[PDB]
Design a protein around this nucleic acid. Sequence first.
RNA 1: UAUGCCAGCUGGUGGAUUGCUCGGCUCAGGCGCUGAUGAAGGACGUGCCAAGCUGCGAUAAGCCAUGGGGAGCC
RNA 2: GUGGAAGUCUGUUAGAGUUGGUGUCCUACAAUACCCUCUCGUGAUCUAUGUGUAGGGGUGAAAGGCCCAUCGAGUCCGGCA
RNA 3: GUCGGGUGAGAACCCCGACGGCCUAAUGGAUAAGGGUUCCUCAGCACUGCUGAUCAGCUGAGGGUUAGCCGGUCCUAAGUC
RNA 4: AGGGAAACGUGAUUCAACCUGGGGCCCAUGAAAAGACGAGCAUAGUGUCCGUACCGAGAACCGACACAGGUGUCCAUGGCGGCGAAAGCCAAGGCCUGUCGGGAGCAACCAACGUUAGGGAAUUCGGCAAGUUAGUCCCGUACCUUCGGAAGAAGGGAUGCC
RNA 5: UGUCCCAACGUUGGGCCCGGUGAACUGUACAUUCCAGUGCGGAGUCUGGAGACACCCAGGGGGAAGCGAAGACCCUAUGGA
Lengths: 143, 56, 46, 82, 81
Amino acid sequence: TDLSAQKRLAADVLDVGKNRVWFNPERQGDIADAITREDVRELVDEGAIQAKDKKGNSRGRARERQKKRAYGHQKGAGSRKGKAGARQNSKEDWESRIRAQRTKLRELRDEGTLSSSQYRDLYDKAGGGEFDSVADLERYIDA
Amino acid sequence: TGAGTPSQGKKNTTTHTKCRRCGEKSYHTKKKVCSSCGFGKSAKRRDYEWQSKAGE
Amino acid sequence: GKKSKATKKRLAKLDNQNSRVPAWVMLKTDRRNHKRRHWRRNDTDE
Amino acid sequence: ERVVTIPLRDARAEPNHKRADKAMILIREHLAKHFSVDEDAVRLDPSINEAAWARGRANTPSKIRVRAARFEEEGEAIVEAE
Amino acid sequence: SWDVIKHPHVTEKAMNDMDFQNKLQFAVDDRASKGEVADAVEEQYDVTVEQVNTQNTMDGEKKAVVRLSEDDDAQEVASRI
RNA sequence: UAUGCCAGCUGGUGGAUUGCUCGGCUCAGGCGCUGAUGAAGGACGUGCCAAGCUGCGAUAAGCCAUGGGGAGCC
RNA sequence: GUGGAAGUCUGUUAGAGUUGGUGUCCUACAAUACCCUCUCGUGAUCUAUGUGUAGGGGUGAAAGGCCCAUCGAGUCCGGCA
RNA sequence: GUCGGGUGAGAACCCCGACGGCCUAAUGGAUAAGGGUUCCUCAGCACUGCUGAUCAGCUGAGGGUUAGCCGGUCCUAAGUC
RNA sequence: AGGGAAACGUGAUUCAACCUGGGGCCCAUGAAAAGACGAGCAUAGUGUCCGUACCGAGAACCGACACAGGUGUCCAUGGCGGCGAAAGCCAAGGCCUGUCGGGAGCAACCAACGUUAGGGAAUUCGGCAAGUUAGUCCCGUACCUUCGGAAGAAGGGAUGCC
RNA sequence: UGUCCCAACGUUGGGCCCGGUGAACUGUACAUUCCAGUGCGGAGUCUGGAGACACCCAGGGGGAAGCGAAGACCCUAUGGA
Ligand SMILES: [Cl-]
Ligand SMILES: [Cl-]
Ligand SMILES: [Mg+2]
Ligand SMILES: [Mg+2]
Ligand SMILES: [Mg+2]
Ligand SMILES: [Mg+2]
Ligand SMILES: [Mg+2]
Ligand SMILES: [Mg+2]
Ligand SMILES: [Mg+2]
Ligand SMILES: [Mg+2]
Ligand SMILES: [Mg+2]
Ligand SMILES: [Mg+2]
Ligand SMILES: [Mg+2]
Ligand SMILES: [Mg+2]
Ligand SMILES: [Mg+2]
Ligand code: NA
Ligand code: NA
Ligand code: NA
Ligand code: NA
Ligand code: NA
Ligand code: NA
Ligand code: NA
Ligand code: NA
Ligand code: NA
Ligand code: NA
Ligand code: NA
Ligand SMILES: [Sr+2]
Ligand SMILES: [Sr+2]
Ligand SMILES: [Sr+2]
Ligand SMILES: [Sr+2]
Ligand SMILES: [Sr+2]
Ligand SMILES: [Sr+2]
Ligand SMILES: [Sr+2]
Ligand SMILES: [Sr+2]
Ligand SMILES: [Sr+2]
Ligand SMILES: [Sr+2]
Ligand SMILES: [Sr+2]
Ligand SMILES: [Sr+2]
Ligand SMILES: [Sr+2]
Ligand SMILES: [Sr+2]
Ligand SMILES: [Sr+2]
Ligand SMILES: [Sr+2]
Ligand SMILES: [Sr+2]
Ligand SMILES: [Sr+2]
Ligand SMILES: [Sr+2]
Ligand SMILES: [Sr+2]
Ligand SMILES: [Sr+2]
Ligand SMILES: [Sr+2]
Ligand SMILES: [Sr+2]
Ligand SMILES: [Sr+2]
Ligand SMILES: [Sr+2]
Ligand SMILES: [Sr+2]
Ligand SMILES: [Sr+2]
Ligand SMILES: [Sr+2]
Ligand SMILES: [Sr+2]
């Protein structure tokens, strides 16, 4: 008996890769008589032909690592491979920071806390890279 | 890269094809001229006396 | 490639010619398609 | 029918990446000899196959306890793990 | 003068098209158009042609798949020749 | 006496030789233009079964007439 | 601080190339191949297809290099015995 | 690759299962050129296949490519006639 | 509608495709034409002709071959990893045909390669071959210089896990 | 730092034996040679001695002025480019 053609029909009827179809060892004779796709579907319902399950990579070990790192662990000098600017894009960081400082200054102004004159002065200083962060900006405003 | 075997792999261009007028595979589909019968070049049929021994 | 209608007619003819000499021709002549071609070993025209 | 322990230390003579194979041969030769039968008559149950190939093709167990039965007119053996 | 219909193309696949989809298949002159095939068929077997599909075969001939109307029964037509 | 040398015998292999000739080669005489009324050539078809050659052209190894010929033919 | 230039750097990214081993091969896997090392990799970059230039003529960042395994004058047949 | 089994006159290499492995810009998927039936089925093993063969891109015999809306077809490019 | 044995989700982050903007460069300026929009709606009819299989490669292409060569495109967002389209391992998918096997602790010799005490380039035309160093962070860095560079100069320290 | 002193042990694939498949190079003849001599002065084959029972396996290559290519050097030709 030679069942390779049936393997191809089976993979198509079961919608799976040929490498995943399973033919019951004790039914080679019946599967061998399977000519049409209907003959295959039939044998499938009988359970003589089945589709082996596919694999998915476990992400458990990954998740535990993701947690240590999110918590700030497992990132000492000995675990870094990329250059500093590669681990954190500096221009990207500046965009993050400067936008945060401008959103801050914009809220203080609408909230009447800053005159458009004090706001302008602080805005130009932020854009000039005067403040390391929001907290640093607030600390400055508090004289 | 050698001029021999390695350069033979790049050859997948079609040039000479079955000729409409004479039937030989000599109709250059790029020049649109048959190198065997002259189709595309002349109304007269390509012919030369050097295609045979001088006294024959 | 892309074949034209004519090319296709010529290819088809080549396929047809590429067949056995009928058995009866053997008997009648009391004992070879000298033009048997193989797609791989040979090369057709065009 | 009896239980025997096959030493597979001679698989070490074959190259490392193919010890599993050589093992399956030693097993058949051992039973053929100790049960006085032709190697062609010795039947190895897949259980034995999976035991020898457990750690891949290069890492065979140094021994293997095997349960083998002998019988029939021409004389044959049937073997399996334990 | 070349005729349109050469002969019925009879093969397993043809029988199915005839039993299941009321279609008849013919070997026809490769110069014939879909319309010329429909007309020719209607005038040879007195039936109504709904659709015609064509194919220039690797045998140098043209094959046409003619679907008849629901009023005509492919099986019965093919069976009278 | 193994491996083996020289010669022959029986049987192979091989296709020389001899015989045979549907093919060549050369000479002599005769004859001698075809095509838009589409030539020559080529392509693709064409047979009950049909690959090659030959013939033929969707009327497709063939159709019609006159004369010859003759009980066979495809 | 911002910005992100460059015949700019690292890079077997794709891709291109080939310094050394004078390694393997050398009736070969191959009439120019295999492996490691090595060089280039935003540009005078690399690449596909189409297209043009023809033999004392092309094409040549020039080596007499290349013009279908052949070029200090291609190939085919003829002159030609 | 190995152990069982299937078919067969015949099985290391044709098929089933299990176990063991290989490939991740590829050893996966879709395709251009080019090839031209190599595609599918049945029946085969004289030929072809780096051994064998029940197998096959091999041999015999049949079958298979269906479009208003996917390409061509239309436009013009370097450029050609 | 369909599809699924079943459930037949809801939110979020990072966001290829695709959409739309801002900036900069040129002794370099980055096609054309057909067509389309501009220019409504109903119903009906017509829409012919040619291609369509398969391979697309360590056996379907070219290389005399079932040749370790050569041969364009897109899949560039599958998981861990890490700067990464890197390595390594693993999915989906494919394969056991980069197609002869059996046997000898399997000798000499050869091809690739691992480990070598003490000495440490004595070897050699020549450190050829092999090796040494190595990723990232911190400190620190000479001569010379066209002030750009030299520079990762050199040299020193750190590096896991919880 | 096995480049060396100075080599060793080990790994994988070959090598060796078995089944199957199955070429090519090369061949005036003879041929078990060795030491001297002789000879167109560079001999397995001539002369004189010596040695020599036949066959087979594995080996590294001393010789056959080994095989491969009508010497690319040099000269000659009332040769070529
Ligand atoms: Cl297309
Ligand atoms: Cl913007
Ligand atoms: Mg910056
Ligand atoms: Mg056929
Ligand atoms: Mg292994
Ligand atoms: Mg169509
Ligand atoms: Mg080009
Ligand atoms: Mg079969
Ligand atoms: Mg192969
Ligand atoms: Mg040492
Ligand atoms: Mg010295
Ligand atoms: Mg070195
Ligand atoms: Mg000479
Ligand atoms: Mg000279
Ligand atoms: Mg001269
Ligand atoms: Na071919
Ligand atoms: Na027909
Ligand atoms: Na005449
Ligand atoms: Na015929
Ligand atoms: Na600046
Ligand atoms: Na190199
Ligand atoms: Na010339
Ligand atoms: Na990733
Ligand atoms: Na095989
Ligand atoms: Na060593
Ligand atoms: Na020697
Ligand atoms: Sr070059
Ligand atoms: Sr190459
Ligand atoms: Sr090409
Ligand atoms: Sr012309
Ligand atoms: Sr002439
Ligand atoms: Sr070929
Ligand atoms: Sr056919
Ligand atoms: Sr650069
Ligand atoms: Sr060199
Ligand atoms: Sr090396
Ligand atoms: Sr070489
Ligand atoms: Sr680089
Ligand atoms: Sr870049
Ligand atoms: Sr050349
Ligand atoms: Sr001549
Ligand atoms: Sr046989
Ligand atoms: Sr097939
Ligand atoms: Sr975004
Ligand atoms: Sr297709
Ligand atoms: Sr593909
Ligand atoms: Sr390839
Ligand atoms: Sr898989
Ligand atoms: Sr094989
Ligand atoms: Sr050790
Ligand atoms: Sr030295
Ligand atoms: Sr020295
Ligand atoms: Sr350091
Ligand atoms: Sr003598
Ligand atoms: Sr030897």
